[PDB]
Amino acid sequence: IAPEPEGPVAHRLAAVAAAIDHKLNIRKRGISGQMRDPSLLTFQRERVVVLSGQRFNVTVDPDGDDLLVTFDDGTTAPVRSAWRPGAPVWSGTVGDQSVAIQVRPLLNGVFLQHAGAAAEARVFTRREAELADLMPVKENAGSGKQLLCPMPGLVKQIMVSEGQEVKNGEPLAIVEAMKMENVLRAERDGTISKIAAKEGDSLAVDAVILEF
Amino acid sequence: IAPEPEGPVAHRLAAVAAAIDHKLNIRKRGISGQMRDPSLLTFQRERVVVLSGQRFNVTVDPDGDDLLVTFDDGTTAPVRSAWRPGAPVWSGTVGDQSVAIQVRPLLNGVFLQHAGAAAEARVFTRREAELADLMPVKENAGSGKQLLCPMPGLVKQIMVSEGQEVKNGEPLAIVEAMKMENVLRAERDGTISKIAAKEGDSLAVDAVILEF
Amino acid sequence: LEKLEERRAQARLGGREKRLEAQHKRGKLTARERIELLLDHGSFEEFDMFVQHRSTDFGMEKQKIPGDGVVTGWGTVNGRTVFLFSKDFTVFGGSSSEAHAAKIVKVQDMALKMRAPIIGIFDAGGARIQEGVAALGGHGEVFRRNVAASGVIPQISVIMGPCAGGDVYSPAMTDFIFMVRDTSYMFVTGPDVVKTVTNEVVTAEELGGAKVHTSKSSIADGSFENDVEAILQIRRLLDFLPANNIEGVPEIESFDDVNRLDKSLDTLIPDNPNKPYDMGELIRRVVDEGDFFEIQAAYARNIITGFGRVEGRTVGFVANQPLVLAGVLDSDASRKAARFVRFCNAFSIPIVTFVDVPGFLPGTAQEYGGLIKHGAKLLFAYSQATVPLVTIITRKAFGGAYIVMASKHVGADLNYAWPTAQIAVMGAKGAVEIIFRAEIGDADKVAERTKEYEDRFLSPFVAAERGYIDEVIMPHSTRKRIARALGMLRTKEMEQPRKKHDNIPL
Amino acid sequence: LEKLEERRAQARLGGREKRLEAQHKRGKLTARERIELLLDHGSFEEFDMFVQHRSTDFGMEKQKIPGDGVVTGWGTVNGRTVFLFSKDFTVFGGSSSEAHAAKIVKVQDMALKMRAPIIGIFDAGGARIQEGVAALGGHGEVFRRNVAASGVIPQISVIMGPCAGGDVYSPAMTDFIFMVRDTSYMFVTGPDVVKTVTNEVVTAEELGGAKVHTSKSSIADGSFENDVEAILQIRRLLDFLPANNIEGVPEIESFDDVNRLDKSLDTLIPDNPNKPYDMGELIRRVVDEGDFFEIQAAYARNIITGFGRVEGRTVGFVANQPLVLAGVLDSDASRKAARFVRFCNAFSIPIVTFVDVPGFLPGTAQEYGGLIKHGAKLLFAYSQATVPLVTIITRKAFGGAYIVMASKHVGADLNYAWPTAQIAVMGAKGAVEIIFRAEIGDADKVAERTKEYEDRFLSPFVAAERGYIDEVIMPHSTRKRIARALGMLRTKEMEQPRKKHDNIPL
Amino acid sequence: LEKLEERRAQARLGGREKRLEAQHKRGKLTARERIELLLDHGSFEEFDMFVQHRSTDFGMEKQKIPGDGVVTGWGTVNGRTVFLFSKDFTVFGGSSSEAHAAKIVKVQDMALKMRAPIIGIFDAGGARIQEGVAALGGHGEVFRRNVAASGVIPQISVIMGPCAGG
Ligand SMILES: CC(C)(COP(=O)(O)OP(=O)(O)OC[C@H]1O[C@@H](n2cnc3c(N)ncnc32)[C@H](O)[C@@H]1OP(=O)(O)O)[C@@H](O)C(=O)NCCC(=O)NCCS
Ligand SMILES: CC(C)(COP(=O)(O)OP(=O)(O)OC[C@H]1O[C@@H](n2cnc3c(N)ncnc32)[C@H](O)[C@@H]1OP(=O)(O)O)[C@@H](O)C(=O)NCCC(=O)NCCS
Ligand SMILES: CC(C)(COP(=O)(O)OP(=O)(O)OC[C@H]1O[C@@H](n2cnc3c(N)ncnc32)[C@H](O)[C@@H]1OP(=O)(O)O)[C@@H](O)C(=O)NCCC(=O)NCCS
Ligand SMILES: *C(=O)CCCC[C@@H]1SC[C@@H]2NC(=O)N[C@@H]21
Ligand SMILES: *C(=O)CCCC[C@@H]1SC[C@@H]2NC(=O)N[C@@H]21
């Protein structure tokens, strides 16, 4: 498991998330068809950055091309970059230090990786952060330690053996239906207890291939 | 089985069918929206009356209000009636003789009952009759000796007994579903060989109730 | 010129004498015979008799048959202009080629320009394999014209033979599909490919026969014993339908009387609320002369759709059938009635609705099948309609089913109710169990409250006091009230807001 | 006046503090919190804050809560006017009464009159049982206005709680339904009646939960983790959509370049024909900044629908997904794509279609389920569209599936093909088996025929020679060609024939 | 693929190098050169580059030239959308065949649908004699489009060679 950010790494990640959110909001406010001129509105300077269950109360101040991010404890960190949405890597300076941060798409946020640490970054207003705090933490269910075959077809290849350790996202078998292969992947972590289906067999819907 | 018409009964039935067809065609030709005036058209006097597998070549000539039907052998049977479509009984004179014929409409024809004889009557033109002769005589496949339950529900009553002979169109059992009764009827002919369910039994679809 | 007549006679032979004889031995008419039977005598004018294909692949240049497997033209049915095309099964199996599709496109364009009905007679194989993608392009042009003509002119498809592959999509977009039993079938994919892929063995009849498409798949609007009966019923249906979306319903001289009373209807509703009755009997005692052209009679038999006449004018009828599934609304009945209502509204056909519905069909099978959107389809069709709407509640109208079945709240013009009507949110027992949930343990109190609720609300008078029902009428005056209401409502003028089209759920 | 502020504060409490605390303990926001989150800060104006019901049955006169269980009003989302109503679950379980439905009707009328989007937030129970048929009448009025607004203004329904009975039919007729996982559900009939009728024991989640309606029943267009995520995604979606059917798609400043080439697309198509690829990767590499709002992502995954931006303007995307069922067209994918295409056309959103489809799904399950009409739905939607249509064939386009997937024959404006495209009636093996059926009993001759057919016809060049494909393009220029084509096609002007509406199969 | 680029380069040659050289020796530009000079740099998008005729009369099946004697497409002139077609005199003398007229009809329909000007560049011979009444039918379709577009979009014809017959 990738460690959560802490200290200066967390501060830099929060500043970068705030800068990306500010850029996206500035672009968003320029949409056409608004009821009145968007210039007649105001941007809420106070922001909350949540880095995987870690809050940062920050203020974003546009100062020229670069962005100025001020944290609660007096510390300020100017942010300067030419990054544009869709670019997989955020490159620029936070404070007075060059940094390269991986940016991945996320629902209402961004997934950030930097200096060996990874975190999901979401930027809210204070009221939005308060409302988001009311949402519960939901736990996933999982799979019943069996690789059910999602479609009928003929088994082409099995790249696992009984008593072998597999992680999540690892391919397990290939099933070909109507002249098209389908790579089945493990949805959990564990060891394969036994293999039921064999290469050349024709399976059906909800058929046991292997047990975890 | 009701006997088919024979001799003068068949002639009267054919004349009545021809008169009904003539009346219906005369009314039909008055529909609105026609490309040109309906009067600027001709009616084919020669007709073929198919009377339950029996053909009569007839000519229809409107002698004023009444209709004159002439058969192949030269005999003429004037038809006079005030019958209107939707009336279950055709009453009038066919060849100076009052008659009463039950009229039950069917697809492209009428079902006629008179003097103890019943027949399906269809009136074609000569070309239409020739084309209809090309159609095959299809035989019904019938039904099996098992009475399956068409809907799930609770059996409320059975009106047949063990070893009881039943005919077509006769009630067999009552099944109630969603606070509504459903009367099941025999689709064939055959003595009941066994009754699988009784009152109070909950049955699913395609469940055996009684066996023929 | 004798040579011109000889060429015409040669073109009339289609494939060959042997193939025509084989066609007749299956009990099927030839394409030209079916056209002759459909049209008024001597009215058929044929287009493109001598058209032949231009393919030079796989030795097709050595097989040039005039007409290219389809007979197109126009005629009259009962004196009214109709366009038609009949695919010739003896010519390359009726398969659709470039010139074949061009002839069909010509007749479709003529039908649309002249605002006249177009009849498609299908006995074919699909796209001609030897011609490659040109056949697909022609099929696409035919599909585009089918979509362009939708809701403008009535389009009738008659399936009188095989209909496989891309051929089936043209009838699917037409208004009505009729099939001949034991000789016609429709499927996107044939039995051989089904066996190859899914490993199941099915015949053509088991996969796409008339029974399957009339009772299970919702595809066909009806089936007939043979070709002659089917074609005569097509002529009857054409007599029922308007020529286009402008001229209105056709009118004939009615032999029936609009002021007659039907005393037998006063005893139609059984005293026992759990006992059903035949709604088809009510429909056939309301229409002129007991003449009713039912649509999709074998499918979703808990509802009834079809065409009748009131005072000589075409009227559409929708009615719950208590004999089947207690008359509840499910997905199949909702889709059937919704399509019928949409067709009637598109062509200015007034709709009469008879309502006896306890609610919707419960269960996981309905919800997983999308009952929400399927019922919304019928609700959408009723709320969208601008044709006259006359609704009669016979016995029951509960809750959302009451709302959907052309209630005044969704735009019905006149809403009548019989004295036995029960317009309520739900049954008395469930309503009491919900309202008085705190005291469900006292049996006598529960029974007393159920009786009080039944007396107060299981009646048409709460709706009548709110104005939701225009009048409670005697059952014997139903036909008279309907005829007078339709006569008054003929001048109805209303329009939906301006849009490209609606977004009705699919 | 301090009394006015006190009355406002009392009205803001809904049911009571205990009910709101229970709502929060369920993990759900209150109706007013949801409205505040959806709208721009300080933009909400509330209508009918003090509206009270007028029912006097069953002791309802002693329970008069201002607002009657729904909060209505209007505001701005990213500066653009939106109308909204949010049902208050704390007030009579959010049930719909006469005054409740009157408030909803007022907000619907305002939204339609002002030509602005309307958002429905559903956390309720349906018609209020104590009010009888008045609640049903109000529901019917809401349904009528939903149908009137269809295709004129975008209608978005957000299910954030129970939605049962007649309540479900209003969202069903809207353009998009979104659900919150583990806390929202939808069904026509509740679990108790299901148990009493069908003897089936089912929970609310198993009957109508988010997973069921996002992956099985085709009802919901998407699901989200919680209320906050769902509302933020609603705000995101509103930025894609036009405000009405006149103003056109909204425009923003794009950070992407329309002239950039994507060399990685030249290796996207695998050499092995049996090897699949992710079409979502192509879509996300074509749209601006890799930003794609997918619609019905969990349902009928053999096809992909969703909204992207090209040069800062909203573009709809439809694409076969080879990863699921080899990218074949079945009934579910056909209906999903058809509804999406209908919505895009109704609101003047151009559609880009990526085609890789070997045909339709065979089997008796598809044929009995009405695959003919369901595929005809997508064909009808494509042939009906008057918005710009740009089609790109990547690997395969066989037969009728090729016709349906926005081919030039059904009205596509520009049809491009990659060098790996294969536009043919069917595969080489089947075509040889049909054309050379007389010599099917060989092994070397059959192989030679198959190879010759593969060389001649399994390519984009037969279609290109007929003009069915405008140009065979390099895969790395796909985005540039799409952007230039859409820029040119913005001025497209086309009209369907005059009609009240079409008769698309349902 | 290099094969696609090779096919494009072969289609760009029209009749042959000798025909193009003879065209240049008369002081005339080629059809593609005329299109390039008319449109803004890099704005030309070509339709139906690989379209070829389907005639099998008088040995035409042995002469299948991509484009069938006309180059069609769209571009911009000073940033404004225009549609155009240039008849290629090197391909059968620029004569109009069924596929040739179909390409012209496609570009005319696009121009009318998009409400943009259409430019016709004529260097041709008329109806292709080997393609019978099909050539005449294609000419008639082009005429119908010309009449339909009259007074809706500006139509400009440039005669840069022979223009005879229909
Ligand atoms: C439509 C269909 C169900 C007809 O049923 P059938 O009578 O049992 O099949 P037939 O072979 O006898 O068809 C009759 C003729 O029309 C031809 N034909 C049928 N469909 C055709 C098509 N789409 N293209 C070209 N020719 C076709 C057949 O080759 C056959 O020729 P033949 O008499 O000289 O042998 C079936 O032919 C069909 O599905 N055709 C579509 C193409 C196909 O897939 N054929 C193989 C499946 S059998
Ligand atoms: C919508 C529904 C699934 C909500 O789930 P639920 O929370 O488990 O059910 P609840 O009883 O707790 O509903 C909350 C309150 O709103 C009320 N309510 C819910 N739906 C109502 C309706 N249509 N009319 C009037 N009141 C209603 C309930 O009576 C309940 O009142 P209470 O808290 O004082 O006891 C369910 O209440 C429902 O289906 N309501 C429709 C009417 C019905 O059929 N109720 C019986 C089925 S449980
Ligand atoms: C249009 C025209 C004035 C061109 O002038 P030209 O250069 O002196 O005539 P050309 O013979 O050299 O035409 C060039 C080629 O295009 C061909 N061509 C020209 N018009 C054609 C047509 N309508 N159909 C088919 N081919 C045609 C010519 O056959 C010639 O072929 P070639 O080079 O292999 O010998 C003349 O060719 C013409 O009128 N064509 C119409 C058909 C006709 O009547 N031809 C005989 C009159 S010369
Ligand atoms: C008692 O047996 C159950 C009565 C309530 C259920 C019935 S089933 C058909 C109707 N539809 C519905 O939702 N409820 C009614
Ligand atoms: C070989 O395995 C079968 C190839 C032909 C069937 C396949 S299945 C998916 C495609 N759809 C269709 O109708 N045929 C294709």
Author numbering:
A (entry chain J), B (entry chain G): 455 to 666
C (entry chain A), D (entry chain B): 5 to 510
E (entry chain F): 5 to 170
List sentences from the manuscript.
Glycolyl-CoA carboxylase (GCC) is a new-to-nature enzyme that catalyzes the key reaction in the tartronyl-CoA (TaCo) pathway, a synthetic photorespiration bypass that was recently designed to improve photosynthetic CO2 fixation. The biotin cofactor that is essential to catalysis is covalently linked to a lysine residue in the BCCP domain of the α-subunit and acts as a flexible arm that transfers the carboxyl group derived from HCO3– between the active sites of the α- and β-subunits.
While the apparent KM value for glycolyl-CoA slightly increased, the Vmax was 1.8-fold higher than that of GCC M5 and thus the G20R variant with a kcat of 9.8 ± 0.2 represents a very promising candidate for GCC-based applications. To identify structural changes that might be responsible for the catalytic improvements of the G20R or L100N variants, we solved their cryo-EM structures at 2.05 and 2.31 Å, respectively. The G20R substitution is located ∼8 Å away from the 3′-phosphate of coenzyme A and has no obvious interactions with other residues or the substrate. Arg20 is positioned in a flexible loop, where it is preceded by two glycine residues, which add to its increased flexibility. Based on G20R’s position on the top rim of the β6 core of GCC, we suspected that it might help stabilize the interaction with the α-subunit and indirectly also facilitate CoA positioning. Indeed, in mass photometry (MP) measurements, the G20R variant formed more higher mass complexes relative to GCC M5, indicating a more stable complex formation. Thus, the higher fraction of α-subunits bound to the β6 core likely explains the higher in vitro activity of the G20R mutant.
